[PDB]
Amino acid sequence: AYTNSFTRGVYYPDKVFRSSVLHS
Amino acid sequence: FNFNGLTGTGVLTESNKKFLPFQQFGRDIADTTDAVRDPQTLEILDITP
C-alpha cells in the first residue's frame, strides 16, 4: 500500500529563539 | 556583561517572552543576540544597544 504525506516532517533546526520572522 | 561566556554591552530589561526549556538565547533578522535567560534566576531579559 502507498499513501501521500502532504506537509508532514518538519522540526526545529537550531536551539535559538526567533519570533515574527521568516528563516531559510 | 558576560552571560555563560557570551560578552557584550547594552541595557538589560524585563522581557515577556517564553523560551522553551531547550533554548538559551534569542536572535533577530540581523542575527545578533536580543534576549537571554539568566542562568541563576531563570528569568528572561532583553538586550538593547
Relevant terms:
part of a larger assembly, 2 chains, 24 residues, little secondary structure, viral protein, covid
How large a portion of the residues of chain A is in β-strands, by DSSP E?
A: under 5%
Structural class of chain A: little secondary structure
Largest beta-sheet characterization of chain A = none
Cα distance, first to last residue of chain A? 34 Å
**Residues in helices of chain A, as a percent range:** under 10%
| Total strand segments of chain A | 0
Protein name (chain A): Spike protein S1
Walkthrough of the structure:
The PDB classes it as viral protein. Keywords: SARS-Cov2, covid, viral protein, Linoleic Acid, Spike. The entry is titled "SARS CoV-2 Spike protein, Bristol UK Deletion variant, Closed conformation, C1 symmetry". The structure is cut from a larger assembly and holds two copies of chain A. The first copy, chain A, is low in regular secondary structure. The first copy, chain A, is 0% helix and 0% strand. Chain A has no helix or strand. The termini of chain A are far apart. Chain A binds chain B through residues 15-19, 21, and chain B through 17, 19-20, 22-29, 35.
Put the structure in a nutshell.
With 24 residues, chain A is low in regular secondary structure.
